[PDB]
């Protein structure tokens, strides 16, 4: 079908003017990686770019970043024309020039920093009129080439004399400034971002379709999550990336007025959105406008919600206006909005993970100069509980420390600080550590959902248990048709019973890692808190989360904690039943199998568990976790010690054989104690060495040698003295009797 | 519309209401429809503003004046009967009430048919399965599902096919069909079921599903079928049929199945309340809800009411010895209160089930309440073969098996145990099939044979090997001491 056109889509590379094609297309376009290619674009404009080769991209999709898209006016999903240009001809000093009315912190010689490093080692192709952007001095400035001596385009060569002008020509009105946000300015919310994109891509890019078919599109969307998660940012990014008109409404602005003015402003906003269709309306602080009627007392407060409901009902009749609202939690607002036709569609943003936090740091560290000791992976690992706003604040504070310390001493009297000295300063990881330790009001203490990192090789032994868990979890998701052919419906729910410290908690995360599914863990203290507070409703919310995070795995430990609280095995006057387990059974019975939400429980006192939860339709498969044996103990030792430096004189097999009836926790404690002894010895040796020679005024005396980089059998055998059994043999007999009496 | 009236001032709202009533009067025969009635006239306890109370009196006066003028009829829609004021539910304003409830499998299938008329569908639709798995959804949910299933396919196909070829026309528009995979995606990924409350419907279980218990079948028919079919026979003599029966027996003997088999045989509604619900009522001290249940049974007559785990509360507060106290508790007291004040003519049977009848409060066994007690014993060989045949009539099986031999080899078993045996055998079969298929797929991929298909179902049906393997883990569930206790209770009567 005239294979000249091709769709445009996102690119991974940071550089400008580079298009990555799909490899199976080499000789059809006939151009290799050393040929620059002309791409057409709207309002009769073009660009020229060098090309790369990659496998992952689709056949019909070029990959190219924002700077090379905007001048083409090409918006993602649009189609452009690609044609080879081996006739490239070099230019002689294309004239390049800053854009916009003014540039912050702009003076002096900006060309030796924002031009020459960029053009260097590049041979970047460039067409007259392009908006290629450069970055430095922690600022992103884009320079439009106004004149090219040859035409239409030129390669930049190091032999071209350079032209230092630096005049602020203001930007033309029609183009949308590169200042605006895009899909590349958000990280950690890829799944929900894709959901929204696929949900609202057709009604805006294809409305004539929706008038060509009889179907009902969504006309209301709710986003719920903690503050500082990027909701309004996502809305504005979606609006900018489709050309749809964007309108903003703030709750306090409406609540800071009288009835007439407020209920006029709402209607005028709705009509203005109607006029500029296709358009999107965004509302934030919805709870501030329409909470549940229990918390509303003023009559005007109840009158302002009816107007919104009527407007929402009338929206379905008119135009293509879409409406999005932001809220903290779904239950904080009126249930009358969550109906069919007003706010049917709902979405959760959740929290970023280590990868998400690292991506946010990359977004916020683009224009900042950083040293070679950043190792942002460590920061992401130690950044637990923070969100995007927290990361931005941390980065700003880390920069502020260094700049305020250095500049004040250097330049407060030398001269008016200029761009060169401004950007000469780098950043150092110690500043990040200070800004992360001193200022740590983490704004998160609630539950967490994410794919864990534990793996099978972390687990020592229990291969049969691994197979039996795979058969339960992997098979139903991978191969349903086989279950359909036969009559068995997979049973969802398993119970681990065994001695403490045998690795029960690790398998629940290993399975999720293997299957790449979310995981949730609820500990015994939470159950006891719910019991004491008589707050059973919370249980419901948990399952809702699991419903909206499917496929997912739910974990419960210390399930016998409540039975232990109200007496022991004999117990207080009463029965095995209690409130929270009753609610758990109620929630389990009323849940669909197709949702794919497995349930795991763990305990060491199965006898005092209520039998009602072991019946068919609930936890029905029981697995026993025995104590590690010599072959498993050696594996446990190797797994634990694969992170610390160790010598070779050790005999791990000897240690494993010398231990009988031990637990993984005991061996980990032994390793930690040996490490403690080693660090104590190193500290003592270092301090003694430092103190002894200071009295002797020898300016140069360094016998620098790691006193004990690795541990030997001495420390381990010293730790053997305190190492002893943890679980009594009587408990082992009880567990075996329970495992046989079944 | 309620919000339209509530989004104005007193004068405008109370003028619009009167004008609407007048226009309805002028254009007789006219029907007025009101929705979100609770938004206008809730209970006075939740109303504080004076204007809110002033708007309800106007509606009451208009309703009172309606009777004198014209043929205007008034219909209102609410969520629950108790969410609005009680002064409207009087003689002359809102005397007549109706419940819409929830659609059943047939209703859901009908709704899907209504929503799939003008859409083009493939030959793998099998809407029966979708209706079966669509549990808790309502009409709006089904419409949303159909729209989303269509959207998936159209969006995936059109964007690739026509975004550059040509302005999409009708021919390419309607050339696209729909597939069951799209339905499965739209029903799994998007499953915002908007229903978790109770359910009322005629069950599907039949007598053939039950194994044995023919005398119990006759005794239950005599109790249920005869009163409804032949009232004049009871009138000629002096006996009044007794409503209420209690099943007592060992666990896993089919007690729950008979309550639905009777309803299916008589084509009557059925309601089931489990023990966790009762324990929730007890812990929350929420007894009023009990009343609501009976109200539903009153508006769904003829119907059957079922209670299981009736000894759960007694077990909770100690065992047979129990905590310091008596047999009576709050929920059973309320149940007795509701049972006594119920008319026989409404035809609402009550069934209870238990396995520890000794610790049941005797006040519920008195005449006028549950008084007919039936014992469900462990299945025998003749019954056990029937259970095996009934459960295995839905899976492919071979012929080398000897069902009779398995029946004789089992003694003191329950239906649950045999069902578990069948499930375990099926699990073994599916595991073997998966392993064989994956090994076959992996072995020949290394060998670059573009054409190699020895396609044969590795194990379409099960054989005696798997069944005998599962017989290792199969064992008794109910102790003989329990059967002795049940016989002692059945004799001491
Ligand atoms: N997912 C994210 N990725 C990158 N930055 C984010 C993200 N979420 C929030 N931010 C940061 O938060 C700031 C905006 O906060 P905002 O999302 O408006 O708060 P709220 O969540 O209350 O709407 C931005 O400066 C942005 O850098
Ligand atoms: N099979 C195992 N493989 C490796 N480590 C184990 C294993 N079992 C227990 N451990 C050790 O036990 C510790 C965690 O104990 P945990 O599993 O939480 O106890 P419990 O099973 O009582 O919850 C970890 O530090 C881990 O090193
Ligand atoms: N008479 C019977 N006929 C067929 N199946 C039975 C019978 N009794 C029990 N079952 C089996 O028991 C299971 C349901 O047990 P249930 O009757 O709910 O136990 P309980 O009687 O304790 O309520 C079903 O899967 C069914 O196959």
In sequence order, what DSSP letters do the residues of B301-365 get, joined into one string? -SEEEEE--TTHHHHHS-SSS-SSS-S--HHHHHHHHHHHT--GGG-EEEEEEES-GGGS-GGGG
Q: Indicate the helix (H) or strand (E) that contains A154.
A: strand A153-155
For A479, other C-beta atoms within 10 Å of its C-beta total 16
Integer Cα distance of B211 and B218 in angstroms: 14
For A483-537, strand residue ranges (E) read 494-497, 518-522
Return the CA Rg of chain A.
32
The dihedrals phi and psi of B32, each to the nearest 5 degrees, come to -100, 135
* C-beta of residue B207 within 8 angstroms of C-beta of residue B225: no
Cis peptide upstream of residue A632 (ω within 30 degrees of 0) = no
Q: Indicate the helix (H) or strand (E) that contains A250.
A: strand A245-250
Experimental technique of record = cryo-EM
**Span between the terminal Cα atoms of chain A, in Å:** 70
User: To one decimal place, what's the resolution in Å?
Assistant: 3.4
Integer Cα distance of A50 and A19 in angstroms: 7
| Residue B311, burial from CB neighbour count under 10 angstroms (0-12, 13-18, 19+) | buried
Nearest to A215 among B147, B275, B319 (CB): B147
In the numeric block, the tokens 């938004």 are attached to B39
From A94, A95, A184, A98, select the one nearest A141 (Cα to Cα).
Answer: A98
Integer Cα distance of B88 and B94 in angstroms: 6
Structure tokens at B106: 């047939």
- List, in order, residues 6 or more apart from A247 with CB less than 8 Å away: A269, A272, A273, A276, A279, A280, A281, A282
- The nearest alpha carbon in chain A to B79 belongs to A336
* C-beta of residue A116 within 8 angstroms of C-beta of residue A143: no
Q: What is the per-residue DSSP string for A497-511?
A: E--SSSSHHHHHHHH
Q: How open is the CA angle B332-B335-B341, to the nearest 5 degrees?
A: 145
Which residues in chain B (221-250) have CB-CB distances under 8 A to chain A?
Answer: none
Ligand 3 centroid to Cα of residue B251, in Å, is: 9
CA A212 to chain B, closest CA, distance in angstroms equals 8
* C-beta of residue A94 within 8 angstroms of C-beta of residue A128: yes
The dihedrals phi and psi of A81, each to the nearest 5 degrees, come to -105, 130
Burial A333-358 (b: 16+ CB within 10 A, else e): bbebbbeeebbbbbbbbbbbbeebbb
* C-beta of residue A425 within 8 angstroms of C-beta of residue A402: yes
Beta bridge partners of A291: A333
Integer Cα distance of A124 and A682 in angstroms: 55
Q: Indicate the helix (H) or strand (E) that contains B299.
A: helix B288-299
Integer Cα distance of A125 and A118 in angstroms: 12
DSSP state of A176: P
Spatial strand order in the sheet of B348-354: B269-273, B303-307, B348-354, B245-248, B372-375
Q: What is the per-residue DSSP string for A275-336?
A: HT-SEEEEEE-GGGTSB-GGG--SHHHHHHHHHHHHHHHHHTTSSS-EEEEEES-GGGB-TT
DSSP state of B38: G
Q: Where are the alpha helices (DSSP H) in A369-462?
A: 376-382, 388-411, 419-424, 429-437
* C-beta of residue B426 within 8 angstroms of C-beta of residue B463: no
Integer Cα distance of B263 and B206 in angstroms: 9
SS3 at position A714: helix
Interchain proximity B283–A340, CB inside 8 Å: no
Interchain proximity B276–A582, CB inside 8 Å: yes
SS3 at position B115: helix
Query: Residues of B within the annotated binding site?
Result: 79, 115, 252-257
From A263, A306, A336, A301, select the one nearest B49 (Cα to Cα).
Answer: A301
Q: Where are the alpha helices (DSSP H) in A54-101?
A: 66-70
SS3 at position B379: coil
From B310, B416, B322, select the one nearest B356 (Cα to Cα).
Answer: B310
Bridge pairing between strands A518-522 and A552-556: parallel
DSSP state of A4: T
In the numeric block, the tokens 């408990």 are attached to A731
A202 in contact with B at a CB cutoff of 8 Å?
Answer: yes
Evaluate the CA torsion angle A369, A372, A377, A381 in order and state its sign: negative
Integer Cα distance of A246 and A650 in angstroms: 68
For A244, other C-beta atoms within 10 Å of its C-beta total 20
Structure tokens at A689: 């060495």
Chain B positions touching A222 (Cβ under 8 A) are none
From B141, B74, B75, B146, select the one nearest B102 (Cα to Cα).
Answer: B141
A211 in contact with B at a CB cutoff of 8 Å?
Answer: no
Spatial strand order in the sheet of A95-98: A95-98, A139-147, A133-136
In the numeric block, the tokens 């290799």 are attached to A32
Query: Considering every ligand atom, which ligand is closest to the CA of A184?
Result: 1
Chain A positions touching B316 (Cβ under 8 A) are 574-575, 577
Integer Cα distance of A595 and A592 in angstroms: 6
Bridge pairing between strands A494-497 and A621-624: parallel
Integer Cα distance of A711 and A178 in angstroms: 57
Name every protein residue with a CB atom under 6 angstroms from any ligand 3 atom: B 210-213, 251-257, 387, 390-391, 415-416, 419
Nearest to B164 among A5, A201, A303 (CB): A5
Integer Cα distance of A699 and A605 in angstroms: 67
A213 in contact with B at a CB cutoff of 8 Å?
Answer: yes
Nearest to A79 among B36, B164, B323 (CB): B164
Bridge pairing between strands A95-98 and A79-84: unpaired
Chain A positions touching B177 (Cβ under 8 A) are none
Which residues in chain B (247-306) have CB-CB distances under 8 A to chain A?
Answer: 274-277, 279-280, 283
Ligand 1 centroid to Cα of residue A392, in Å, is: 9
Cis peptide upstream of residue B29 (ω within 30 degrees of 0) = yes
DSSP state of B114: H
For A557, other C-beta atoms within 10 Å of its C-beta total 20
For B468, other C-beta atoms within 10 Å of its C-beta total 12
Interchain proximity B430–A589, CB inside 8 Å: no
CB pairs under 8 A between A and B: 128
Ligand 1 centroid to Cα of residue A541, in Å, is: 25
Chain A positions touching B155 (Cβ under 8 A) are 198, 201-202
HEC sequence for A191-220: HHHHHHHHHCCHHHHCHHHHHHCCCCCCCC
Interchain proximity A573–B312, CB inside 8 Å: no
Integer Cα distance of B213 and A143 in angstroms: 90
Which residues in chain B (21-60) have CB-CB distances under 8 A to chain A?
Answer: 36, 39, 46, 48-49, 51-52
| Residue A291, burial from CB neighbour count under 10 angstroms (0-12, 13-18, 19+) | middle
Q: For atom 5 of ligand 1, which residue has the closest CA? A: A388
Query: Considering every ligand atom, which ligand is closest to the CA of A637?
Result: 2
Evaluate the CA torsion angle B260, B262, B263, B265 in order and state its sign: positive
Structure tokens at A210: 């929706």
Interchain proximity B426–A486, CB inside 8 Å: yes
Query: Residues of B within the annotated binding site for ATP?
Result: 79, 115, 252-257
Q: Indicate the helix (H) or strand (E) that contains A124.
A: none
Spatial strand order in the sheet of A552-556: A518-522, A552-556, A597-603, A494-497, A621-624
- Calculate the CA dihedral of residues A72, A73, A79, A83 and round it to 10 degrees: -10
Integer Cα distance of A108 and A656 in angstroms: 71
Chain A positions touching B431 (Cβ under 8 A) are 471, 475
Beta bridge partners of A283: A249, A325
């Amino acid at each position: 079908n005239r294979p000249n056109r091709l769709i445009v889509d996102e690119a991974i590379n940071e550089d400008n003017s580079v298009v990555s094609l799909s490899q199976p297309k080499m000789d059809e376009l006939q151009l290799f990686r050393g040929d620059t290619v002309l791409l057409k674009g709207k309002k009769r404009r073009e660009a020229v770019c060098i090309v790369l080769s990659d496998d992952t991209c689709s056949d019909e999709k070029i990959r190219m970043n924002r700077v090379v898209r905007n001048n083409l006016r090409v918006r993602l999903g649009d189609v452009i024309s690609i044609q080879p240009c081996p006739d490239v001809k070099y230019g002689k000093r294309i004239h390049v020039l800053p854009i916009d009315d003014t540039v912050e912190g702009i003076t002096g010689n900006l060309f030796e920093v924002y031009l020459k490093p960029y053009f260097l080692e590049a041979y970047r192709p460039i067409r007259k009129g392009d908006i290629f952007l450069v970055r430095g001095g922690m600022r992103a400035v884009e320079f439009k080439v106004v004149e090219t001596d040859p035409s239409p385009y030129c390669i930049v060569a190091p032999d071209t004399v350079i032209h230092c002008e630096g005049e602020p020509i203001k930007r033309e009105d029609e183009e949308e400034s590169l200042n605006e946000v895009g899909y590349d300015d958000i990280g950690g919310c890829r799944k929900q971002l894709a959901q929204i994109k696929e949900m609202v891509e057709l009604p805006l890019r294809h409305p004539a379709l929706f008038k060509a078919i009889g179907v009902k599109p969504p006309r209301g969307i709710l986003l719920y999550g903690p503050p500082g998660t990027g909701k309004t940012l996502i809305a504005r990014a979606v609006a900018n990336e489709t050309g749809a008109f964007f309108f903003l409404i703030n709750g306090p602005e409406i609540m800071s007025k009288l009835a007439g003015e407020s209920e006029s402003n709402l209607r005028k906003a709705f009509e203005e959105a109607e006029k500029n269709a296709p358009a999107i309306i965004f509302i934030d602080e919805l709870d501030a406008i329409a909470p549940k009627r229990e918390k509303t007392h003023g009559e005007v407060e109840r009158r302002i919600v009816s107007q919104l409901l009527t407007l929402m009902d009338g929206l379905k009749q008119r135009a293509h206006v879409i409406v999005m609202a932001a809220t903290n939690r779904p239950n904080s607002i009126d249930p009358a909005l969550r109906r069919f036709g007003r706010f049917d569609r709902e979405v959760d943003i959740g929290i970023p993970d280590a990868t998400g936090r690292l991506e946010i740091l990359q977004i916020h560290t683009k224009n900042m100069k950083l040293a070679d000791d950043v190792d942002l992976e460590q920061v992401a690992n130690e950044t637990h509980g923070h969100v995007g706003a927290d990361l931005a604040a941390l980065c700003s504070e880390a920069a502020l420390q260094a700049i305020r310390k250095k500049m004040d001493l250097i330049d407060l009297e030398d001269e008016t600080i200029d761009a060169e000295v401004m950007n000469s300063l780098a950043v150092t990881m110690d500043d990040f550590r200070w800004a992360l330790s001193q200022s740590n009001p983490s704004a998160l203490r609630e539950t967490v959902v994410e794919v864990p990192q534990v793996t099978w090789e972390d687990i020592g032994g229990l291969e049969d248990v691994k197979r039996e868990l795979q058969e339960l979890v992997q098979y139903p998701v991978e191969h349903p048709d086989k279950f359909l052919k036969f009559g068995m419906t997979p049973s969802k729910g398993v119970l681990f019973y065994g001695p403490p410290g045998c690795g029960k908690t690790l398998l629940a995360k290993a399975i999720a890692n293997e299957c790449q599914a979310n995981a949730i863990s609820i500990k015994g203290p939470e159950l006891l808190t719910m019991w004491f507070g008589e707050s059973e409703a919370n249980v419901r919310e948990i399952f809702d989360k699991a419903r909206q995070a499917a496929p997912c795995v739910l974990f419960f430990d210390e399930l016998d904690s409540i039975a232990k609280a109200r007496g022991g095995n004999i117990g207080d006057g009463g029965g095995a039943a209690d409130r929270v387990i009753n609610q758990i059974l109620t929630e389990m019975d009323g849940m669909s199998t197709k949702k794919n939400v497995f349930i795991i429980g763990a305990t060491n006192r199965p006898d005092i568990i209520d039998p009602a939860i072991l019946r068919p339709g609930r936890l029905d498969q029981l697995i026993y976790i025995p104590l590690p044996d010599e072959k498993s103990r050696v594996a446990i030792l190797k797994a634990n010690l694969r992170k610390s430096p160790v010598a070779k004189d050790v005999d791990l097999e000897f240690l494993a054989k010398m231990t009988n009836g031990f637990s993984g926790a005991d061996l980990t404690e032994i390793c930690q104690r040996a490490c403690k002894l080693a660090i104590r010895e190193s500290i003592e040796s270092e301090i003694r060495r430092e103190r002894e020679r200071q009295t002797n005024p020898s300016a140069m005396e360094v016998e620098e040698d790691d006193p004990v980089p690795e541990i030997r059998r001495d420390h381990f055998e010293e730790a053997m003295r305190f190492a002893r059994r943890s679980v009594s043999d009587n408990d082992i007999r009880k567990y075996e009797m329970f495992a046989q009496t079944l």
